């Protein structure tokens, strides 16, 4: 294929070559005959004398040894001077490649090319898997979704590695090869576009194997986040935060913990009143006494309302963690300024009530807070809680790999300079390419262990349905966290001890049919037996 | 189907000349190199030419340099080897036979692989 | 020129027995030598090229080796038909050398 085309330019130059010596005139001395020695265009060159010419461009490696030039020497016998078997001889040091035809034997090579195939088409129907259902998530009724937005960026960096190899392969099918008797010689030369190309691929490759056990990562992490409980703790820990240390406010006291307020007049030393009381002798069993009597406090204070009691009562658990939250930002006269709002929370209209929220001055403010508290009412769900993390949830995913794999670029390009990197150095590829990736590993089986005995306190108390979502997408980040976590760690401890080889090339073959199809495994859990993927397809079908 | 019929030698007095024959049939003749080998009637084998498609590399043994000249007709299929000034010495059987050879584009290096495809020989005996 | 010193000239074996037929290289000649069977009134049948790969549909029993300078021809069980002569043949230098020839005699 590659080598037909060369054979084509060969021919030119052999048909350019012998018209360019017909139009000279015929010689008058003993010389040597000009001839065409399958190389190279040889004028009449006098006895006892060495001729050169300028590299032939029929050569891939034109550009880079036109300058250089091949030499060819001269006989007393009038005749040039021949090779063992007759052939004609030159010296084409200066014109040779730079990289070495690595032979391959006549059953070796067709292994390895029948290997090939079945990691190509693995691939290929992993891809195609991929796209079709990133394709089915990111254009239908699943749109503005944040457990689908994790899965979709799972994928992405999935398909960029099921992309990358194919690219890969596909330039590395650029080499020349032809058959030198049994063995099939593989020039390792690529062309400049190709060179860059697979380089660029490479990087791209590298950064795709990082981003799936970093999403990996993120799909075990929102389990761990979403499912914990969840508690106002939680809520107001997002909306506040957690703090060891006392600082300042709007109105000039000293806060601490989760919004609590020590002394009553601008002071320090006066702060440890109330907060020894609590402690009755701050970390996060001593902190979170403080911040529970807080909450019981702010439920008082509602029941002793006589405008926010009533809405209080009507609304549930959750919707009312909401209410609370609102009280802890503002007061029971704050939040019992919104007799508008309130009104519609007590009538059960949440969109309505939606509306009116975000129209008052308390949104004004605090956009951000109140978005959430505004989509707590609305659902009467943690949605907005479980969608505060996505934001952090993005940068381990895509910003966590550029922190090893952007410097690796840089220290690959001008340290070991190699055609296409997959190296065996074990010094670049361990530290700054398995360490993120081991790393990751590593906090996922202590997630792991984490969501056993989070599902296990669940699955005996009030919330112990298995037909449950959460439940159900537990079936899924359960299986592909040991699968991938096991796959990868087995392969880098025992690679290192075989040669190229002979068990090697069956150990390969028997692990990259397995990472071939690892794309496809991803799609089909996720997405394909997702049942609330499969209630919205057979209500998209049977429309029609 | 791959076949080598050597043809034409037979009786012939020292001094004159002889051309021997070589048809092949069954692979594509223009690709491979041929050679031209005789083996004495008491004596063991030894080569004597050879010649490839182009065909200005041609070979000889030394007892036969100017003597001997071999040929080819890529488009009827044969070998020659017109045996000129014939002594006592070349009355032989003489076989014919091909050697694939392989040109590396990229390095410029031939590379040989031996005579795979023999015939069946042609006796020729040289006396008065 | 290449003397393709060829020995024994005539080994005597029986049949079943191993025979080792070895041809010594002038120069250094790399692997390019094959490995020719003779039989009587027939035409030289190559059994080994490359020095020791076998030519398609050859009995598994010959084998070739050795590499530059010394070579071997092994017939790990001889059997009737094996009682002809063999030369080997350099293709490494012209001209091109053959040795003198082993003649696999039957013992008795």
């Known amino acids: 294929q590659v080598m037909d085309f060369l054979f084509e330019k060969w021919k030119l130059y052999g048909d350019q070559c012998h018209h360019n010596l017909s139009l000279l005139p015929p010689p008058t001395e003993l010389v040597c005959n000009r001839t065409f020695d399958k190389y190279s265009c040889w004028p009449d060159t006098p006895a006892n004398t060495t001729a050169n010419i300028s590299c032939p461009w029929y050569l891939p490696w034109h550009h880079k040894v036109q300058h250089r030039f091949v030499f060819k020497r001269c006989g007393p016998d009038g005749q040039w001077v021949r090779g063992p078997r007759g052939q004609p001889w030159r010296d084409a040091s200066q014109c040779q490649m730079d990289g070495e035809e690595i032979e391959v034997q006549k059953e070796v090579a067709k292994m390895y090319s029948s290997f090939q195939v079945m990691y190509t088409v693995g691939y290929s129907l992993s891809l195609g898997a991929l796209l079709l259902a990133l394709a089915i998530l990111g254009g239908l009724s699943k749109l503005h979704c944040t457990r689908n937005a994790i899965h979709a960026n799972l994928f992405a960096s999935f398909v960029l590695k099921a992309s990358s190899v194919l690219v890969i392969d596909g330039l590395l099918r650029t080499r020349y090869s032809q058959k030198i008797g049994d063995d099939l010689s593989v020039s390792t030369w690529l062309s400049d576009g190709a060179v860059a190309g697979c380089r660029v691929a490479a990087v791209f490759m590298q950064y795709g194997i990082v981003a799936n056990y970093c999403w990996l990562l993120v799909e075990g992490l929102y389990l761990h986040n979403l499912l914990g409980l969840a508690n106002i703790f939680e809520m107001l820990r997002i909306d506040e935060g957690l703090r060891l240390k006392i600082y300042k406010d709007t109105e000039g006291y000293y806060t601490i913990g989760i919004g609590h307020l020590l002394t009553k007049s601008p002071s320090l030393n006066a702060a440890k009143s109330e907060l020894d009381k609590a402690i009755g002798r701050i970390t996060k069993d001593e902190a979170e006494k403080l911040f529970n009597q807080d909450v019981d406090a702010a439920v008082r204070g509602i029941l002793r309302n006589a405008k926010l009691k009533p809405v209080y009562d009507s609304l549930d658990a959750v919707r009312r963690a909401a209410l609370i939250n609102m009280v802890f930002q503002m007061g029971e006269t704050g939040v019992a300024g919104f007799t508008n709002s309130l009104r519609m929370l007590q009538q059960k209209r949440w969109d309505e009530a939606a509306v009116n929220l975000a129209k008052s001055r308390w949104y004004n403010q605090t956009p951000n807070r109140a978005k959430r508290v505004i989509t707590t009412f609305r659902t009467g769900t943690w949605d907005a809680y479980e969608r505060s993390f996505f934001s952090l949830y993005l940068g381990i995913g895509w910003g966590a790999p550029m922190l090893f794999v952007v410097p690796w670029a840089v220290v690959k390009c001008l340290f070991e300079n190699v055609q296409c990197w997959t190296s065996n150095d074990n010094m670049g590829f361990w530290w700054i390419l398995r360490f993120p990736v081991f790393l990751a590993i590593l906090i996922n089986f202590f997630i792991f262990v984490r969501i056993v005995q989070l599902l296990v306190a669940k699955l005996r108390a009030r919330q112990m349905h298995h037909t449950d979502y959460k439940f159900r997408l537990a079936k899924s980040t359960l299986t592909l966290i040991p699968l991938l976590g096991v796959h990868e760690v087995v392969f880098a401890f025992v690679t290192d001890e075989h040669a190229q080889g002979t068990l090697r090339s069956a150990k390969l073959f028997f692990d990259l049919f397995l990472s071939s199809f690892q794309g496809l495994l991803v799609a089909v859990l996720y997405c394909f037996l997702n049942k609330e993927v499969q209630s919205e397809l057979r209500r998209r079908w049977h429309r029609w | 189907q791959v076949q080598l019929v050597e043809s034409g030698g037979g009786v012939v007095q020292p001094g004159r000349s002889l051309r021997l024959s070589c048809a092949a049939s069954?692979?594509?003749?223009?690709?491979?190199?041929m050679h031209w080998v005789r083996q004495a009637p008491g004596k063991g084998l030894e080569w004597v030419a050879v010649?490839?498609?182009?065909?200005?590399?041609?070979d000889y043994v030394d007892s036969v340099k100017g003597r001997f000249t071999i040929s080819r007709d890529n488009s009827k299929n044969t070998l020659y080897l017109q045996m000129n000034r014939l002594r006592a010495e070349d009355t032989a059987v003489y076989y014919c036979?091909?050697?694939?050879?392989?040109?590396?584009?990229?390095?410029?290096?031939?590379?040989?692989?031996?005579?795979?495809?023999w015939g069946q020989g042609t006796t020729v005996t040289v006396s008065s | 020129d290449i003397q393709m010193t060829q020995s024994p000239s005539s080994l005597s074996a029986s049949v079943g027995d191993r025979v080792t037929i070895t041809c010594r290289a002038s120069?250094?000649?790399?692997?390019?030598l094959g490995w020719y069977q003779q039989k009587p009134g027939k035409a030289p049948k190559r059994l080994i090229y490359?020095?020791?790969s076998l030519e398609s549909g050859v009995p598994s029993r010959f084998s070739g080796s050795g590499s530059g300078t010394e070579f071997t021809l092994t017939i790990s069980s001889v059997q009737p038909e094996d009682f002809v002569t063999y030369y080997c043949?350099?293709?490494?230098?012209?001209?091109?050398?053959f040795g003198g020839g082993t003649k696999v005699e039957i013992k008795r």
């Open positions: 043949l350099q293709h490494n230098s012209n001209p091109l050398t």
């Open positions: 120069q250094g000649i790399r692997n390019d």
């Open positions: 490359a020095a020791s």
């Open positions: 069954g692979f594509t003749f223009s690709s491979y190199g």
């Open positions: 010649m490839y498609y182009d065909g200005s590399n041609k």
């Open positions: 036979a091909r050697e694939k050879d392989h040109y590396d584009i990229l390095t410029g290096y031939n590379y040989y692989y031996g005579l795979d495809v």
